[PDB]
Structure formats: C-alpha cells, structure tokens
Amino acid sequence: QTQQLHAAMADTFLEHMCRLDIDSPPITARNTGIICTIGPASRSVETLKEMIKSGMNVARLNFSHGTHEYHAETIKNVRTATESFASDPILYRPVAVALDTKGPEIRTGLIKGSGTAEVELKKGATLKITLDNAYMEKCDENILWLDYKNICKVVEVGSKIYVDDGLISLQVKQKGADFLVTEVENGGSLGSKKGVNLPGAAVDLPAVSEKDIQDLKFGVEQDVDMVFASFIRKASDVHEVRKVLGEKGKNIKIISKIENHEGVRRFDEILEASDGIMVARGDLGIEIPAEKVFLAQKMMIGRCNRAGKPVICATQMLESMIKKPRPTRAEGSDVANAVLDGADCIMLSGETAKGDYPLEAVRMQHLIAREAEAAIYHLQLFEELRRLAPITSDPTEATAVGAVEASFKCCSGAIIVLTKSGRSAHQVARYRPRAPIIAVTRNPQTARQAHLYRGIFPVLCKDPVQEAWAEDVDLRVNFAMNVGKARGFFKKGDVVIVLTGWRPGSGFTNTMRVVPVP
Amino acid sequence: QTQQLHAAMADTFLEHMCRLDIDSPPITARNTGIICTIGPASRSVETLKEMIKSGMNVARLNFSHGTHEYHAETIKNVRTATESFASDPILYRPVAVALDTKGPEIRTGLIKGSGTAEVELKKGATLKITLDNAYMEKCDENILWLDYKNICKVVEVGSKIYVDDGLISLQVKQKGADFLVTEVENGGSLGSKKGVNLPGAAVDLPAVSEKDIQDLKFGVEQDVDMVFASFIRKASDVHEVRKVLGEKGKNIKIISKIENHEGVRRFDEILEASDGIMVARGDLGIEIPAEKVFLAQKMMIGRCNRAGKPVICATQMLESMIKKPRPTRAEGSDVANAVLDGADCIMLSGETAKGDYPLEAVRMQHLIAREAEAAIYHLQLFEELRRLAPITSDPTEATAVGAVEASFKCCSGAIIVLTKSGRSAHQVARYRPRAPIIAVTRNPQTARQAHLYRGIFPVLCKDPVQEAWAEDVDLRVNFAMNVGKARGFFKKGDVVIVLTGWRPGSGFTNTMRVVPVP
Amino acid sequence: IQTQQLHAAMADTFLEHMCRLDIDSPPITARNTGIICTIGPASRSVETLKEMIKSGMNVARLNFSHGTHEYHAETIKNVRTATESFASDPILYRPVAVALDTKGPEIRTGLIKGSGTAEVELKKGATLKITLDNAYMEKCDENILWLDYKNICKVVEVGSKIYVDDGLISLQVKQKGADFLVTEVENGGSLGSKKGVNLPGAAVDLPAVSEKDIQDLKFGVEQDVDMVFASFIRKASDVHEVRKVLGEKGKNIKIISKIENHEGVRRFDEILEASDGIMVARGDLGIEIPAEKVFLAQKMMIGRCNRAGKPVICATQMLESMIKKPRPTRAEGSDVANAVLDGADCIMLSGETAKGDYPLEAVRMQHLIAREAEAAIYHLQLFEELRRLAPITSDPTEATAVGAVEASFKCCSGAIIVLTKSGRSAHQVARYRPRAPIIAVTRNPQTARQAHLYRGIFPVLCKDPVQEAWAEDVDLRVNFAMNVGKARGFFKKGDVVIVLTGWRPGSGFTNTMRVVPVPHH
Numbered sequence A, B: 001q002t003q004q005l006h007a008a009m010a011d012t013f014l015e016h017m018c019r020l021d022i023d024s025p026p027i028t029a030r031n032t033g034i035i036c037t038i039g040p041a042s043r044s045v046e047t048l049k050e051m052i053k054s055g056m057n058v059a060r061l062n063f064s065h066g067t068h069e070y071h072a073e074t075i076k077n078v079r080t081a082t083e084s085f086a087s088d089p090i091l092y093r094p095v096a097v098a099l100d101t102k103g104p105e106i107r108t109g110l111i112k113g114s115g116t117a118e119v120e121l122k123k124g125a126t127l128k129i130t131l132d133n134a135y136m137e138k139c140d141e142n143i144l145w146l147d148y149k150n151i152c153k154v155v156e157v158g159s160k161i162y163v164d165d166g167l168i169s170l171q172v173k174q175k176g177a178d179f180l181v182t183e184v185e186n187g188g189s190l191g192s193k194k195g196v197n198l199p200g201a202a203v204d205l206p207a208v209s210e211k212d213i214q215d216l217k218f219g220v221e222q223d224v225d226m227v228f229a230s231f232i233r234k235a236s237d238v239h240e241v242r243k244v245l246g247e248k249g250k251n252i253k254i255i256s257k258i259e260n261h262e263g264v265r266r267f268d269e270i271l272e273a274s275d276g277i278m279v280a281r282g283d284l285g286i287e288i289p290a291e292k293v294f295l296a297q298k299m300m301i302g303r304c305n306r307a308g309k310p311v312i313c314a315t316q317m318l319e320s321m322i323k324k325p326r327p328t329r330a331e332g333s334d335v336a337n338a339v340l341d342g343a344d345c346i347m348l349s350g351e352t353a354k355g356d357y358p359l360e361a362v363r364m365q366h367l368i369a370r371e372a373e374a375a376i377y378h379l380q381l382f383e384e385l386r387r388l389a390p391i392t393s394d395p396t397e398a399t400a401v402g403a404v405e406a407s408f409k410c411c412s413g414a415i416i417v418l419t420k421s422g423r424s425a426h427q428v429a430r431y432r433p434r435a436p437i438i439a440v441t442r443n444p445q446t447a448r449q450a451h452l453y454r455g456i457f458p459v460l461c462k463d464p465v466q467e468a469w470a471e472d473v474d475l476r477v478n479f480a481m482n483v484g485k486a487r488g489f490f491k492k493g494d495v496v497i498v499l500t501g502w503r504p505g506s507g508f509t510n511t512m513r514v515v516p517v518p
Numbered sequence C: 001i002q003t004q005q006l007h008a009a010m011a012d013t014f015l016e017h018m019c020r021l022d023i024d025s026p027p028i029t030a031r032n033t034g035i036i037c038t039i040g041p042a043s044r045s046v047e048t049l050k051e052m053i054k055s056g057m058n059v060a061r062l063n064f065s066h067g068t069h070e071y072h073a074e075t076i077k078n079v080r081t082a083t084e085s086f087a088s089d090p091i092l093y094r095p096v097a098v099a100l101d102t103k104g105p106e107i108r109t110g111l112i113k114g115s116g117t118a119e120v121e122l123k124k125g126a127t128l129k130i131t132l133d134n135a136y137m138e139k140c141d142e143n144i145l146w147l148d149y150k151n152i153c154k155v156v157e158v159g160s161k162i163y164v165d166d167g168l169i170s171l172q173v174k175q176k177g178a179d180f181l182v183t184e185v186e187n188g189g190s191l192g193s194k195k196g197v198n199l200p201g202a203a204v205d206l207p208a209v210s211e212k213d214i215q216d217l218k219f220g221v222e223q224d225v226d227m228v229f230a231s232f233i234r235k236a237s238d239v240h241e242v243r244k245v246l247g248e249k250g251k252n253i254k255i256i257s258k259i260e261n262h263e264g265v266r267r268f269d270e271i272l273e274a275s276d277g278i279m280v281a282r283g284d285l286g287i288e289i290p291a292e293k294v295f296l297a298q299k300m301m302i303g304r305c306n307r308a309g310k311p312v313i314c315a316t317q318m319l320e321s322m323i324k325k326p327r328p329t330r331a332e333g334s335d336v337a338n339a340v341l342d343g344a345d346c347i348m349l350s351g352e353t354a355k356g357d358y359p360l361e362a363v364r365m366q367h368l369i370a371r372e373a374e375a376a377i378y379h380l381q382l383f384e385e386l387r388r389l390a391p392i393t394s395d396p397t398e399a400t401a402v403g404a405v406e407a408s409f410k411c412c413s414g415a416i417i418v419l420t421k422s423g424r425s426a427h428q429v430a431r432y433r434p435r436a437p438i439i440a441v442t443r444n445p446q447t448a449r450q451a452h453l454y455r456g457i458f459p460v461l462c463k464d465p466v467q468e469a470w471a472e473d474v475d476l477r478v479n480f481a482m483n484v485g486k487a488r489g490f491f492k493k494g495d496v497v498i499v500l501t502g503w504r505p506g507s508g509f510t511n512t513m514r515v516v517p518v519p520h521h
C-alpha cells in the first residue's frame, strides 16, 4: 500500500496514528511551500539554480542587515537563476521573492569606549536605565542606555526587561520620569548595541521604522511578490504597511509576523487585515515563555486554516544544519509536525543564508514535508473544514468543495485550476485535498504568489491567447496535463479534476469536470 | 427560518432532535416516492387523474387476485390518466406501473360443502391438520387440510401456525409424519382456501409459481416498469425471476420482497442479485415476531442505503384510512420514521385499492414525507455515506459526490442531471442531497423507473434532437430550469447544480456546473 | 449468534448500526421503558388488574374527562388491592403508581335545536355566525353556533381557523365584532351538540385549572396519587397554578405537563423548566397543529426532555387497533419502537386498556416492543452525546452516576444498583441512559412508585426495619436488590454488577460506586 492510505482510512485519530507505515512511500508531489532566506552562503546564481532544483519556492531577503545595493544584487541573482529554466515552460518552476522588514527595535548603547568591550552582570545587582543621551557611548554595569525614549510609559514596577536576545533579564523596581532602577535576575556578559524586548508590554513603537518605510518602498521598486512585515502588534500596524506599499504595490501580499504577546492577543483583528501570517518562533519565544510557543504556533496555524489564509512556520526548524549535513531527530520532528499542524510554508533562515549546508537543508525540508503530507488525517480534517464552512451562495466556493470532495472520492492525481488571480486555486487549497493543485495562469505574479498556499503548484502559460476562447481554455488544460505528466504526478489512465469558468475574466470559475489523463 | 435548517446545523443528533421545529415549513419538493396499489376504489380514469395530482408516482398491481383481462384494464386506465397531462411536458409527471407477483403459497381446503360456509375456532380447542386428501373438500373445526405436502418435515412441536393472513393462530402440540395436532391460541372464523404461513420455518416452495411464470410473461407483454417479486428467500429465487422475464424483459427492475425469516437471514445475497428491495411488513410480521419487524425494516433500509439500491416500505402505513378520513398518530409516526429511516418509496395497499379514502391517503403520505425529509440529519447522513463510499476511479461517481457536496454548500435549489439510462441520477441520489434531483431524459422508461429512488424528479423531454449536440444539451438544461421554476422548486437568482457529460451516450457524465437560475 | 444487539452496538457509524440490527439477537430479560395504562370499564376489576401488573403495567392512569369521584375512588381501591396482592413477598412485589389526568379547560358548543342527539349539516363555503349570547345555548342551528368561551373574540383575528368537534369541522373568521364572529365553513360535516372546540394558533386565555380541575386535583391529594398529568399546559404560569392547587399537602406529587397545542409547543422550554415531566399528548396536539407535523413536536420534546433529564411520556393511539383486534398494525408496532428509540421514558395506552377488547394483549405487546427497541438504541453515540452536553459540575452525585454508567458499559453489567431515599440518585443514573437496568432500592413507597416515570429504573421497596449498624443496613439493602435481580432473571451468580451507595445516611451523599460480582446467597 502507498501514500499512507491504509492509515487514511482509519475511523479513529488513534487508529490513524497506529497505522502510519514507514514502508508506505509518498506520492511524488510536495505540497508545503519552502521558503529559503538568501545570504552569503546561497547568493550565487550557480548556487541558486541548485536551491531551486532542490525545492526552494520562495527567496526571503532579511532587511535586518545588508544595504539596498547588496539586496538588489541578491534579487537579480535569484531572478537570473530562475529564468535559466524558463526555456522549457513545462518544467519551469516559478520562484517568488520576499522582503522581510527589519521592523522597530530597542537597542542599547556602547559599553565604556569600544563597542568590543563587555561588562559582567551579577544575579541580584542594581542596574539603572537612563534615556539621557550623555550615556549613549559610556554604558557600564551600573548605568545602561536605550533608544526607546518612551520605555517609562509602557512599563510598570515589576515588569521584566530582556536584554541581548533574552539572555539578560531585569525587573523594574522603581520608575521615575527619566530613569528606571532595575534588579538583575539573569546574570551574564553585557555587550554593545544589544537588542531589548519588553515582555508583556504594549510597545508603542511606530508600525514601520524610518528604515522600514524606505526598505518597503524599495521592495515596491524591486517588484517583490510578498512582504513579511515585522513585529505586527495590532491591525493598524498592518494597515500602515499596506498604506506604505500603497497603490503601486497594492497586489503585494502582506504577511504579518507575530513576534510578541500583543501580537498573539490581537491575532484575530490582525489576521483579518493580513493576507497571511508568519509564526515568528525566534523573537516570539523571547517575548513569551519558550515552553508556550507551540501553543501559539498551533493556535495560529489553526485559525489560519479556518480563515483560508496562508500561514508560515519560521525559525530554527533545521538549525543544526548550519553546522552539520544531517539534522537532529527533534528538527526532523519539528518539520513533520508543522506540516501535520497544517502550515502552508516551511522556512529556513540561518540554514540557507549562512550555513555550511544550504542544499542539504532544502532537500531535508522537501523530504519530510512529503512524508508528513501523506500522514495527515484528511478524513477528519476534511469533515471538520466542511462542517465549519460558512453557507455561501458563491458558485466559486461551491465548485471548490465539490472538486475537493470529488478528488477524495477518486484518489485524483491532481486538481487542475485555470486561475487569473489565483483566487480559484486558493479556494481549492483552503480545503486541503491530498492531491496537488496545478494552477495554470498567464499572470507571472500569480504564479509566484501561489506558492504561499499549501498544495498549489503554479504553472505559467507563456503561449499567446488563442482566437476562440474555448480552444484557449482547452490549451491551458492541456498544458497542465503535460506538466503533470512530465513531473510524474500522474500517467495516462489516472483520473484528474479540472476546474474552469464559463466566461473569461476573474471569478467565473464554476465548472468541475472529472477527466481521465489522455 | 425554513426547511428545518436550524436543526440541520446541530453538532449532535440530540441537539438535532431538540431543534426540530413545527414552525419551520418544508420546501415544495417531496423526495420519497409514493406507491399506490390500484384496485376497486381507484381503478377509474377519473379517479387516477386525482391520484396522480395528489402525488402517486407508481401504480402497484397485486396479482394475488384479479384476472389478466382485469389487470390489463387497470393498466389501460393508469396510462389514460397519465397521458391526459402529457400535453404540457413541463407539468407532466411520469407514472410507473408495477406488477407484484402472487408468489408461492400454502392454502387450506374448502369448509364442509360450499366454499362459502365458515367454522368457528375457539381459544384453546384442538385443531388437527391433515394432508390426507379426503379432507380437501370437507374441512370443519376439528380437521383442517393444507396443500403443502412438506409441512411436517419443517415444523416441530411448539411451532406457531398462522391461518388466514395471521388472523388465526395455532401451536403444534404433537407432530407425526402425516398429521399435526394443534391448539387454537387466537379464535376466529375459519373459511375456505385461506392462506398459511409457518413462521420461522424455511419454506422450500419453488421460486416462481406456475401462475407466476404466466403472470410475469404478461407483465413483459404489458410493458410494466418493475416487478415486486414475492417471497424471495434466497438469491436463486431472484435469478429464477430474472430468467423468466428473460431477454424480452431484461430491462424490468426486479424488486425482491422480503417476507420471512430466510429472506431476512439471507438478505445480503438477495440484495446483491436484486435491483431493489421491498420490506413487506404484513407477511413479514406473520413469519417473525411482530415486535421484531422494526428491526428488520431498519436493517434493510440501512443496507439498501449502503448499497445505493432502492428500498420500499410497505403495508399498513395508513391502515386506518381504509375506514376513516384522517390517520392515527401512530400511522403519522410510522410514515415519518420510514422516511427518516431513509426509505426510497413509501407504499399504500388497502388504503388506495379498497378504502373509502384513496385520495386522502395519498395526500397524507405526501404531507408527511415532505416534513420528514426536512427533518433528516443530513450532516451525519452525508458524513456517514461519504466515509463508507468505496474509493473508485469511476468519473461519474466522483462527479455525483462533488455535485452533492456542492449542493449542501450552497443551499442549492436543485441538482439537474441529464441522464439517458437514469444511472447518473441514481448515483446522485445514493448520496441523499436535501435538494431535489430533476432528471432530464428522453427515455420514457427511464423517466418512469426513476421514481424508485429518493429525490429524483423524472422529467421527460419529448422533443427531437436538433442541430449541435451542445445546444441540444443546453436545451435540455433549459427544460429542467423551466420545470423547476414552474413547480416552485426555485426562482430566478437561486443557484443550482447541473450535471452533463463531455460526449453523447451513457457513461461520460462528468461535468458539474454551478449556475444561477435565469 | 450474539445477543442483545451487541454487534450493532459496536458499529462506528449510525448507518452501520442500523445495518447491523439483527432479528435473531434476543433482548435481555429486563425492560426499561415504563408502561402507563389507562384504567376503565375493561380493566377496573381486581382480577384483571393482577393480570395487568403481571403483564407489565407500571402506572395506572385515571382520565378525569369522564367518571365521578365515587367511580374513580373505586378504580384506585382496586388498583391498590391488585398491587398489594403481591406484597406478601417483597422480592417479587412490583410497585404500581397511580396517576390523575385532569380534564382541563375546554371550549364546548351548545345543543342543536331541540334534542341534544339531533344534528345539522354544514356545507363547504356556507356562513356560520358564532355568538356567545346565552339565548342561543339551547337552539344551535347551521346559521348560529354558541360557545362557552366568553373570551373567544379577544384571542382570535380575521383569518384564524376554528376547529369544531375534534377538528372535524373547520371554520375561518371573516369578520370580528365585540360579541360575535362571522365565519365561513372550510370543512363540511355533521354538527352535533356539546362538541369540543380548538382554537389553532390562538393564545387561549382559559385559566390553567378549571373549577372541576381544582376539585379533581384536591381529590387526587386526598386519594394520595403519585402524579398528575395536567391538561392543556400552555405557559409556565399554568404549571405554577397546578402546583399551587396541590399546594403544601401535595407538594410531593409529580406534576407532568401535557403539551396539547401550539402555545404549549412554542413555550415548551419555560414549561419543561417548571414541570417534573412532560407528556406528548399526540391526539389533542394533532388537532391543534397539522397532523403531519406531530412527529416533529414529539421528537423535539423527547429530545429536550432527554437533555434536561426530566421524564417524557408518549401518548395516544400507539396501539389503537387493539381496541378491536388482538394484534397491532405494523405502523403501531413501528410507532412504539420509535418512541423508545426516540428516547421516551414511558409509553402509554388509552382506549386500548380502558375500554378495548384486549387490555392484556396491549400491555404485553408494549412490553415486547420496548424490550426489542431498547437493545436497538445506539448507546455509543447516545452516551457520547449526553456526556458532551453535560455541564461540568462539582456535584459528587453526578460524577458518581456517570462513572457508574460508564463502568456498566465497560463490563456489560447485569444492573446498576442504587440505594435511593428520594429517587434522586436513581434519576441521575437514568439520565445517562445505560443499557443495564437500574434497580433502585428504597424504603419510601412513594419514591418506589414515582420511580417508574424514568427510563430503566426498576423500583424495589424494602419493607424491613432499619438495622442497628448503618453499614449492615446498607449491606442489607444491597443484598435485597441482589436477590430481586436474581429472582427476576436479570443476572445469575458470576455476572458483574454496579452498586451505588453513600458515605453517610440521608439524601444526596451518594458517592460510592463499586463493581461487584453477584454472590452465591
């Protein structure tokens, strides 16, 4: 038996688990998109071809560091690598580009002289915090400076303050107008220009930094497909970013990054305003107890699945592959679970940008995602989504459910959807069929953006439009049939689902057909 | 709110019940077919028009009694009444004809002298059963004769014996090779040529009687649409009936009537060989304890639903309306529960054939079935059917499920299916949508036979094919659109599901579209 | 080859459950659904009542529609005589309860011109004037019809239907004065005298209890009935009225509200809350609302009663044909099964036992079907569903009951034995609907009788004096139930059973569940 089918039949979740089989090989398609952060270790065209081949679907650009000219080159290279395969449209896999903003931060000043010197903080000692600028350059173990002018307004006696990536931990014992008197809870080495998190606080830093405003305008100019907006806390934040990309970039998918408590508390309003979500586990698990992170991940992927909006699963998934060519069992497990949890993307940071093994990381993510995709309990997952599906008399939605049910009934090798905007394909994906969704689009941006949705395989028709709209439709169907055939998703005989519309232009998708592969 | 929708939403069966609402009116469509036995009280053309109008869909002819000339006239009249409405194909309802065989029997002899005289059986008296032929003509209250040579082999001391349609009740007190000595439990008037059931005993009479052979040949000649084959006990039996209708009548649906223990015990093999099933509660509740009947009914409707084959629910459903113009609460309840149980047909016997109130019986069945159809727990019913659906790579099946899912998603006003053989419509019905299935067919037999399946509204296109196959398809779709409109199943604006094929001829139905009503 | 429909109880889907019901899977010997028989001409004799009890009667209904105090007093005397005839052996003694069903408020017409036996003929489409003016009481023709409901005008609009003689005749109001109505005949028929009137869809403002009712109820107090079926309950204030009337001296009598019209259904919630139980009065009900809609109301009501853990009764015409015939119609058989499957506590017999030719055959038939249907329930889901809709509470008694019921499912327990003073503990077990019979052991006779009102409680009345050590007194009552169960054939030595006790004497301390093998005692 194959593709974990015996397990997909089980009546109980428990029997489902009990029946997972290591000798049941997956289908060839892989549904979870893979996002790789590009950096020193992966910027070369020659390398990027190898990434795409290994399964990269999105390129992340981390505006934490690096200048415009530097990033512009990364993008130019990603593009070069991608179009290298454009010469055969059957096999060409689009690659999307993503601009991840630095976001607002709270940084400390320099330690006494050189930014290279450190001071030693003792569990229990007093540590005064000034905002007075005199102290910017000379930070010792008695006085520490911040660039968050308004820290006093947003903290109470008793609040924790986390310094250098939540290594050092302070607690506020007294609050003036200008200063704070803290006690060290967690000792350690204090350095220069280190980053500060205010756990629990409603931090009032603007939605976008001045750097961000400019970094974003650049992304518009460079024509990125999506932005990962950092440190989204409230929906007004998302609205800021939207305003900033403004008209010229009104089609760029804004993906809100949930990095602290306020973000979690206000996730609902946020999700509403966002195109998607990234569960930013790194920053998040500095702001909230680490043991609580899986809760937040599961809550978020859950609600994103309910709302049919893309969710990303980020940070440290294959961390050890920065140094080693194979991952830890926990890393293997982390990735499987994100997939089973029902995440759209999975992401690689260090592992691809700086690590010794970028390719090994991508292939590993590819391998696990496939195995985990077969291991889903679609029986229940489908039943559940269907039961929570709002009543709508929108034909597109009705067609999608019909299609997805049909695909379950006939172990369909794929659901083929003609889509101009991607909307139709999204509607199919939101129901999470086991079968890959081949989305056939003439719109390249649609092709790239589609990766953000579990199971959509974007496929870009480069032919001119044919005279009769009928034959043009048939042509695009036939294209997908060829793509599917060639990529080994199905052979002559197998059955497939095809979704078409009744008239040209967007949102007329309403025709579902069950077709045997020619 | 309408159509018991608030109740259809409930997460539990219990909440579902708790939420059934007497102020939530049904839609106008009624899905459960209604089978009326035609007889003295209903044979007139003038009456039959009124039956059709009231909701009769099949005419049952009981070959228990009546000659060929008699039945031939019933059929002539049914036909006359039906075609009376043929002048407007939008409103014309097809009517099927069904031949219900007499089947093998065990009969008694004549009472002392004229077969017009009777005897009295006294609770507690002795009643000898002979097979000795001396007694054939002279049966008194001391000695009773049977024509079933093999009774003694198949009955033990303690067995019950039912005489005259389980009116009189005997228990065997001593058993020889040649005779039985019984005690009367239920007193009553013993007549001539009265029928006998040996409850629990496995009666070995041949599958088809001599009369049956001939009655069946007649049904072939008369062009009936289905046969209700009596006293089906094993699959061999069904095979006999099929052989007898043979080639000339290979298209007539055989519906096996389960009338005794062996029939229930062997239901599986039977169902497999049959086109459908009738739960013959009268006979059945003479052969098995009456308190056990609802078990058998529920088991059989259940397994017929599982197999997607039509089940009928017969006998005494509105019994009191033989004498009275309104039914008892228990009768009302019986009918609702048949529908809730998931029966295709419901049936009337006495109530339409002999009763004082044939029309009131039909209208009553119509009224209840509608209310009960809304009261079904489709959420679970659908979930269950889907989970127990074989995985199949037949396109038609995949299209049907998709169509039914779609219809649930959009509160579809109807699922419109173009079908030549009826197969496609059956496949949609087997999934039990809330929405009516309008089947559009040019084949009149298909039209009539369709009534045997929950929710199919057969609609007969009498026009020739013209011009392009496409526009012929559109034409038939449009016909159904008009039928639906006129019968008040939906208005302009409402959304409907339409099933077509990709090519002419049977099979190939594989196109589902979600269309707003013009 | 299996028993008690076990293979079917295992099924993962409702559909598979149905598909697996088996006519060769015989039930256990216990029967859980209580059976209520109306006593009348055909069943009032002591000699007959012994045979009824034997056959499975658990409650005796008295219909105050008809019959005088002296008459009913005698029926009760006899029921009691028949019952205590078996009191000589407490192991085999079955308690029988007594129930007073009130006549309730009515709307009656006057006498047809001259003899109260003579009739008029009403033609579809004719005009029919309705007066309340008393001049017309004695002389009712086909043009003018009198009612005794002085307030009809206030409670009906132009367009309202009026149903005369048990919804045989049907009028629609065309004009409404201060004093009169002008109606049109929709349903023709023969109009008689003193015939009953229903106002479908009206909020009928007749008092909750009639003057007759007040008195009939006071009688029930005096006669020491266990429950009252209050007729024509419409709003909760109605139930409060009945309670007020039974008042203090009768504060322990269970009031069971009878739902017989629209307002009753519309307001069922408030009503159920104020009632001890409910009767689905299908006859009257299906005159007030379209008959085709009644199964909706029945199913809604039994449903919500199950949710609330309050007793529900299913009434009227369940085995109607057995007034004249010794066996029922397939639809009657089916009706009874479905009431049980629907999850009704009691089933009822009216005509069938009171006036019919075959009272005993009706009782035995109800007994037979209920047993079969009880095995046919889908306990898996029924239990899952009740548990999921159970509020979280910190009440030990509830925790013990669920535990008990789950344990009984686990071990195919032959019975759940509960020592109960008020019945409350047994009710709490029953509200979860175990397959196993609940033997409730009580020294309180009223508790014994009232217990019948709940699916699956088998009341068993300990007549012994209290034993010195409270422990051994507890053991004694457990042992009693063990003996009863043995003798009634509910289990044998070896079988396993669940026993519920408390930690201290007096009510509401039940918190001990044990799993005990049946002894060689």
Ligand SMILES: O=P(O)(O)OC[C@H]1O[C@](O)(COP(=O)(O)O)[C@@H](O)[C@@H]1O
Residues within 6 Å of the ligand: A418, A419, A420, A421, A422, A423, A424, A425, A499, A500, A501, A502, A503, A504, A505, A506, A507, A508, A509
């Ligand atoms: O994916 P979207 O934006 O909903 O648009 C889907 C549209 O694509 C089609 O299937 C074909 O696209 P064209 O308009 O480019 O012919 C339409 O028939 C349909 O309405």
Ligand SMILES: O=P(O)(O)OC[C@H]1O[C@](O)(COP(=O)(O)O)[C@@H](O)[C@@H]1O
Residues within 6 Å of the ligand: B418, B419, B420, B421, B422, B423, B424, B425, B499, B500, B501, B502, B503, B504, B505, B506, B507, B508, B509
């Ligand atoms: O040959 P026709 O009458 O045009 O048939 C066309 C339609 O009938 C179908 O054959 C229906 O299938 P069935 O007859 O098997 O039910 C389809 O291929 C198509 O939708």
Ligand SMILES: O=P(O)(O)OC[C@H]1O[C@](O)(COP(=O)(O)O)[C@@H](O)[C@@H]1O
Residues within 6 Å of the ligand: C419, C420, C421, C422, C423, C424, C425, C426, C470, C501, C502, C503, C504, C505, C506, C507, C508, C509, C510
């Ligand atoms: O010895 P007693 O007072 O009869 O009570 C025996 C046990 O049954 C209970 O009375 C339960 O009775 P209730 O159902 O009336 O609460 C316990 O509280 C007690 O332990």
Ligand SMILES: [Mg+2]
Residues within 6 Å of the ligand: A103, A230, A231, A259, A280, A283
């Ligand atoms: Mg960050």
Ligand SMILES: [Mg+2]
Residues within 6 Å of the ligand: B103, B230, B231, B259, B283
């Ligand atoms: Mg027969």
Ligand SMILES: [Mg+2]
Residues within 6 Å of the ligand: A011, C012
């Ligand atoms: Mg199963």
Ligand SMILES: [Mg+2]
Residues within 6 Å of the ligand: C103, C104, C231, C260, C284
């Ligand atoms: Mg009444």
